Amino acid sequence: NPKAFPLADAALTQQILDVVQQAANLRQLKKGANEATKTLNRGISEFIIMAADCEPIEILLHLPLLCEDKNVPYVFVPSRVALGRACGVSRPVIAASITTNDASAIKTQIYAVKDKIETLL
Amino acid sequence: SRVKKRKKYQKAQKKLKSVRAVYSGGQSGVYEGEKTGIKKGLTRSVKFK
Amino acid sequence: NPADKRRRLAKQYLENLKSEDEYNNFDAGDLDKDIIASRLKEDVAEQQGRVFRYFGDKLLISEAKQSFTRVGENNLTCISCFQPVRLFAYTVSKDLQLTKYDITDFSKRPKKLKYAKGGAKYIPTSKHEYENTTEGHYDEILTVAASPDGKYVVTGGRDRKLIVWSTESLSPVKVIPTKDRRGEVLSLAFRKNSDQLYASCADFKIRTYSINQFSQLEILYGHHDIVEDISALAMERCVTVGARDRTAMLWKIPDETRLTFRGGDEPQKLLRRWMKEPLFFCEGSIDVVSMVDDFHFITGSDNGNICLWSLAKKKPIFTERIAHGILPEPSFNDISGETDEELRKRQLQGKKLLQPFWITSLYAIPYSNVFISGSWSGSLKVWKISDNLRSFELLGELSGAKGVVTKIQVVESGKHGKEKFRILASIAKEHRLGRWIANVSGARNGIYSAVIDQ
Amino acid sequence: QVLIDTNFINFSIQKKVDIVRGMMDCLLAKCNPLITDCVMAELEKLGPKYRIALKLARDPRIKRLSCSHKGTYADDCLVHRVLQHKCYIVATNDAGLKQRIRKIPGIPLMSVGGHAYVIEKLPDVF
Amino acid sequence: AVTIRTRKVISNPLLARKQFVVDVLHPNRANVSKDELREKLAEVYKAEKDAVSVFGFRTQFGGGKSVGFGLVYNSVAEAKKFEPTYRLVRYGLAEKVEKASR
Amino acid sequence: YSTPKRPYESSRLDAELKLAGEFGLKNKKEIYRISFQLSKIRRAARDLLTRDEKDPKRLFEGNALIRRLVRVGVLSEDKKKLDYVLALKVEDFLERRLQTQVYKLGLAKSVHHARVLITQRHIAVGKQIVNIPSFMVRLDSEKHIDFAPTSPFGGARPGRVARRNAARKAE
Amino acid sequence: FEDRFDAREHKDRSNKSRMQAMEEYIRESSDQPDWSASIGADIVNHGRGGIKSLRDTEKERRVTSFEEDNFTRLNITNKAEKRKQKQRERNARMNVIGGEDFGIFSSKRKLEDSTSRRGAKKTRSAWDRAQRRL
RNA sequence: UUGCCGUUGCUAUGGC
Ligand SMILES: [Zn+2]
C-alpha cells in the first residue's frame, strides 16, 4: 500500500477523464485542491479525483481523510498533466471535484463512474 | 395550457412540503438551528406490524 | 454458439441477396456510365492519387545538416511554407507575432524578413461577437497557413479571427471573425493547388473559405470534442481529428458527409495477447493528422501511438505503440517529502505512473513514402511506410531539436531521382495549446531545420 | 416485485395464465413474484384438492419471503408488509383485500380478470 | 459575397454546349440572384453572357446553399437556337405572346 | 397516440402532474404519445424475451433494437442487454427532447425558458435551427445544441426591442 | 415445352429479403465506414418532421443523383404524392423515433423464413452437406 | 542566428 493507494488503471482513467472533461464543459467541475476541499466540506461533491504524481503527495493526501469523513468516493489518476488537460485549463491540476447537480445532462455517466470507482474503493 | 400546469405544479410541490419533509439540498451555510421548533413528544417514524 | 450463428446467418443472408468468369462479361449500365466518363471534363482536382513517390529507403538519413536557429519569441506555435510550381516560410508565436522567413538559401539557416506583431492595442472596443473586425491579433495566434499560390498567408488563433495577410508586405487585407464566443481556431489547411482554406474551430465546427473572394463556403459540423487538427490534399475531401472523442473523420465537403474512424485499443486484450507467452495500454486523445494520399492517412495520439488508417477500414490498419518513449519518472527528491529513500521509492508504485510522450506533431509528405513525428523526446523520428501500404517502420532519428515540436513540415529540392529536403520543425518549450509541460530539459524556442539529402 | 396470494393463484390456474408470463405481459416489465410463508401455509392448509395449485406455487421462478409472525393470516401479512414499505405490487382477487389495498395509497393492485392479468394503481403501464 | 462551385462538367458537341451542376453559396444572403449569378458564371467561364444560362434552382432548408443546373454556350446565336422559348422570355430577348381566345 | 386504460385514476393524475411540471409539457398528449410508442417498443421487447436464446429473431432484432435505442440515447452504452429495454420508461424518453436538453445544458434557466427559446428559434442543433420543443435529440446531436448564429443570444445583430431602445435613447 | 422471356426472373429484385435487422448487423460488422451526414444537415422541417430515416436518406441520395444526372426536377404528381408523401410522413411520425425507425419491432414478418435459411444451397444430402463443409 | 542576458566564433551552444 502506497499513500496514493486507490489508483485507477488505464481504462478507468480514461473513463474518469472523459467525464471530467464533460463536467468541465457543463460547469459541474470545481478544479484545484483548495476549491476541492471547499466543495467537499460544503457537501456539494459527487467524487474527487486526485493525481498521484504531483511534486509532494501529502499536498493532496489531505483530501482522502475529508472524503472518508463525509463518505465521498475518491480516486487517483496517474497524470496531473492529463488531468489538467481534461479539466480544460492551461495548467496541470492535482485535484478536482464533480459537484452535485440534478439539472445535469451527464448524471448517468457520473453515476456510472461513481459506481466503478466505489467498487474499486 | 402550459402556464396553468406550471402553476399547479408549483402549488403541488409547495403542498408536498406540508405532507412529507422534503430534502431541500442539505446544509446551506452555518448550522443555525432547527428554525421552527423541536418536539420531544412526537415520533414520526413507521413502526413495524 | 451465438456469434457463430450470427456469422452463419449473415453469410446465408448475403448469399440469398446475391440470389435475388464467363467469356462475355459486359454490363450495359456500367459501359454507358463509362461513356459519360469518357464524355466529361475535369480530370484535374479529383485524382484519387495513390502513393507515387516510393523513396523511403532511398535517401540518406543519418548525416543531415541540422541547424537549430534559435529565435527570440516565447513559444513558437506553427510553421507555414510555400513552393511555386525564392521560397518563403512563416512562423507565429504565443507572443502574438507572425514572422516571415526566406528559406530558399538551402544550404544554410533561414533568413528573417518581416515581423507582424499584434498586442493589447487590437482588443476590440465592443466585447460583441460580430464586430470583431479589427486588424490585428490580441490573443494567442495558434495557426498560420500559406496559400498554395503564395499571394496570402492566413492566420488565426484564440481571438476567434481569421486575418489574411498579403505576402509581399505582411499587411492585413481582410478580417473574418468566426461570429461566436467559443470560436477559437485550432488548425488551418489549404487544399493543395487552390485558394480554399479549411479551418477547424473549437465549436465542434469546421469552417471553409475562399480566400481570394473573401467568402465563406460551408460550415460543417460533427465532432464531439475540439477539432484539434486538420489535413487536406488536392481533392475536396478533408480529414479532421477531434481530441478526446478518439475518432478521426473525413469529410466529403460538397456532399457534407463524413466517414468516421474510431480507435479501440484495450489493454485487457492487448495484455492477454502478450500473456500468451509489457507496458502498453489504452488511448487518451487522438491529436494530429496528415493525409498521406487519397486512400490512407496517419494519426498521432496522446499515448504516443502513431496509427495508419485506410479509407476502407473503420478500425486502423497499423499501430505503433510507443513512438517517442516514456517520460522520465518524477524524482524521489520531488515526489514524497519523507526522509528515507525506501518510502520515497514506495511512492512511485513501481511502473504504474510512467506516462508516455505524446506525439504533438506529425507530417506526411503528400503522396510520398515517408512521414516525420515529433514530441519533446528531443529527437524527431522519420518513418517510412512499406510499399504494400499496410505498415510503417522507423528509418532514423533527427536528434538536434531540444523541446516540444509544435510543427513539422518539409521543403523539397532536386529532381525525380535525386532529391534533398529541409525539414522545418517549430520548437518551443511549451505545448501549442496550453502550458501543461514541466521538466523543460534544455529546450529553446527555435526553428529546427534539417537538410536531408539523396 | 409482486406479492401473490392464494385466490390469485387459484384464479390463475382456473383461467390458465402462467404466473411469471402473465405478470410479464401484463406489466410489460420483468417481474419477481413472491409467495410469503403465510400464503404458502394457506395453500397447504387448503387440503389435497389444491395439490395442483400448491405445486405450481412451488416453482423456482417464484421467489419467496419469510414472514415472522404467529398465525397464517395472509391478508394481515400482505397489508402490513405493503404499508410498511410501498415497494410492492399486490396481486390479489379477494374483495376485502382489494378494498384494503386500494384504500392505502401508492400500492398497485393486480388481479385476474378475463383471460389475463389486469393492473390498476400503476400509472405507467403503456 | 456570393460564392460559386461548378461540378460534373460535361461537353455536349451535338448541342454545342457545356453543362454542369451549380452549387451556389450565399451565407447571410437571401438567394441566388440569378442575373448576378449569370454574370458571375459568365466571368468565371468565358464571356458569352447571353449564352450562359441556369434554370433548376433549389435552395436547401435554412438557406446558404442552392443547387442549380448550369449550361453555357458558345455562339449566342446557336444558344438562341437551342434554348427553349420560355427561358428566352425569362432571360434573353425573345417575346412572342399566345393568341388569347376560347 | 392512444389514451390509457383507466385515464382518470388519481395515481395517473398525479403522475401526469409531476411529468408535465417537471418537463414543462403543455398537455397530456405529449406523455400519451411518447408512452404509446414506448409501449410498442417494450411490448416488442417482451416478445423478444419470450422467445429463446439462439433464435434468429431474438439475436438480430435484439441487437438491432438495443443499438438503435442506444443511438436514440435512452439506453447507455454498457447495458447491452434486452431486459433494460423492459426497465426503460417514459421520462427516460422525454429527457431526450430538446426542451429538457436545452435546460440541462444550461442555455436556459428553466424548462419554460427553454421552450420559449426553442419556439423563438434561438436554438440550433448542428446546422439547422430546430424550433419545436419535442425533438428527441440523439447521442451524437447531444453536444451541438448551441445558440443559433442568427440570434442575439449567439453573436448576431440584436433584435427589434434592443435596437429600438438604442435608437430612442440615441434620440 | 418451350421458353418464354421472363424479366421477372432475370430482374434484380433484392427487396423481398432486405431485412433491417440483418442490414443493421451487416452495418455493425462491416469494417468500412458508412457516410453519415454533418449532424444538423439531415433534420428536415426545423424538427417538424423527424430527423430522417436511413431508407429516406438513401432514397433522397438516389433522387438527387438521378436529378443531377439528367438535369430534371421531379414534380408534384398528385396521385403518387397523395399516396406516398402523406402515408410515408404519417408512418414516419408513427414509427421513426429520433432518426431510428421502430416500426419493424411491431410487425409480424419471419426473418429466417424468407431471408435466412438458404434455398439453393439447401444441402439435402449427407454427402452434399459433407462436401459443403469440407 | 533573437527578447534579454553568459560562454561568445573571428561559429555553435545554455540559463532565465
Ligand atoms: Zn406472512
Phi, psi of G101 (to 5 degrees): -90, 125
Name the nucleotide with the smallest C1'–CA separation from C429.
H16
Phi, psi of G12 (to 5 degrees): -70, 105
Q: Is the separation of the CB atoms in D13 and D52 below 8 Å?
A: yes
Q: Cβ of residue C228 near strand H, that is under 7 Å?
A: no
B46 touches chain D (CB under 8 A): yes
Residue C190: partners with Cβ closer than 8 Å, 6 or more residues away = C145, C146, C147, C148, C196, C197, C198, C232
Q: Which residues of B9-39 are buried (b: 16+ CB within 10 A; e: fewer)?
A: beeeeeeeeeeeeeeeeeeeeeeeeeeeeee
Q: Which three cell numbers stand for residue C191?
A: 487544399
Q: Is the separation of the CB atoms in A110 and A46 below 8 Å?
A: yes
Q: Alpha carbon of C86 to those of C68, C89, C103, C168: distances in Å? A: 21, 10, 8, 12
Q: Cβ of residue C69 near strand H, that is under 7 Å?
A: yes
For F140, nearest residue in chain G (alpha carbons): G39
Closest CA to F88 of F135, F52, F39, F137: F39
D28 vs F5, F14, F42: nearest CB = F42
What distance in Å separates the CA atoms of residue G116 and residue F60, rounded to the nearest whole number? 11
Q: What is the DSSP string of F89-129?
A: -HHHHTTSSHHHHHHHHTSSSSHHHHHHHHHTT-EEETTEE
Q: Which residue has the cell 505498415?
A: C391
Closest CA to C386 of C454, C317, C325, C450: C317
What distance in Å separates the CA atoms of residue G118 and residue F124, rounded to the nearest whole number? 48
Question: What is the span of the domain harbouring residue A88?
Answer: 1-121
Q: Cβ of residue C400 near strand H, that is under 7 Å?
A: yes
Q: Give the CA C95 to C1' H4 distance in Å.
A: 15
Q: What share of chain D is helix, strand, coil (3-state, %, to 5)?
A: 45, 15, 40
Q: Is the separation of the CB atoms in E46 and C235 below 8 Å?
A: no
Q: Is the separation of the CB atoms in F60 and G110 below 8 Å?
A: no
Q: Is the separation of the CB atoms in C255 and C330 below 8 Å?
A: no
Q: Do B48 and D69 touch (CB under 8 A)?
A: no
Name the nucleotide with the smallest C1'–CA separation from C95.
H3
What CATH code is carried by the domain that includes residue A19? 3.30.1330.30
For C128, nearest residue in chain F (alpha carbons): F155
Residue B14: partners with Cβ closer than 8 Å, 6 or more residues away = none
Name the nucleotide with the smallest C1'–CA separation from C65.
H12
Q: Give the CA C427 to C1' H11 distance in Å.
A: 21
Residue nearest to nucleotide H11 (CA to C1'): C67
For E64, nearest residue in chain F (alpha carbons): F127
- Dihedral angle over CA of C114, C120, C124, C125, nearest 10: -140
- Dihedral angle over CA of D50, D54, D57, D63, nearest 10: 150
> Partners for E (CB, 8 Å, 3+ pairs)?
C, F, G
The domain limits of chain E are 3-102
A27 touches chain F (CB under 8 A): yes
Cα D9–chain centre separation = 7
Q: Is the separation of the CB atoms in E56 and E37 below 8 Å?
A: no
Separation of CA D41 and ligand 1 centre (Å) = 9
Q: Which of E25, E43, E44, E61 to mutate to test the interface with C (most CBs of C within 10 A)?
A: E25
Q: Give the CA C379 to C1' H1 distance in Å.
A: 21
What are residue C411's DSSP bridge partners? Answer: C422
- Dihedral angle over CA of A64, A69, A71, A72, nearest 10: -40
Q: Is the separation of the CB atoms in D34 and D3 below 8 Å?
A: yes
What are residue D124's DSSP bridge partners? Answer: none
Q: Which long-range contacts (CB under 8 A, 24 or more apart) does G105-110 make?
A: G105/F40, G105/F41, G105/F44, G105/F45, G105/F48, G105/F61, G105/F65, G106/F40, G106/F43, G106/F44, G109/G19, G110/F57
Q: Cβ of residue C314 near strand H, that is under 7 Å?
A: no
Class assignment of domain E3-102?
alpha beta
Phi, psi of D124 (to 5 degrees): -130, 80
Q: Cβ of residue C71 near strand H, that is under 7 Å?
A: yes
> Partners for A (CB, 8 Å, 3+ pairs)?
B, C, F
Strand H nucleotides, any atom under 7 Å to a protein CB: 1-4, 11-16
F116 touches chain B (CB under 8 A): no
Separation of CA D42 and ligand 1 centre (Å) = 10
This entry's atomic model was obtained through cryo-EM
Q: Is the separation of the CB atoms in C131 and C124 below 8 Å?
A: yes
What is the β-pairing status of strands C111-117 and C141-146?
A: unpaired
Q: Give the CA C93 to C1' H14 distance in Å.
A: 22
- Chain F CB contacts of C2 below 8 Å: 53-54, 59
What distance in Å separates the CA atoms of residue D14 and residue G91, rounded to the nearest whole number? 41
Q: Cβ of residue C444 near strand H, that is under 7 Å?
A: yes
Q: Which of C6, C17, C227 to mutate to test the interface with G (most CBs of G within 10 A)?
A: C17
Q: Do C347 and A3 touch (CB under 8 A)?
A: yes
Q: Give the CA C428 to C1' H15 distance in Å.
A: 15
Q: Which three cell numbers stand for residue A88?
A: 480544460
Q: Which three cell numbers stand for residue A87?
A: 479539466
DSSP class of residue G103? S
Q: Cβ of residue C112 near strand H, that is under 7 Å?
A: yes
What distance in Å separates the CA atoms of residue F65 and residue F63, rounded to the nearest whole number? 5
What is the β-pairing status of strands D109-113 and D116-119?
A: antiparallel
Please count the structural domains in chain A.
Answer: 1
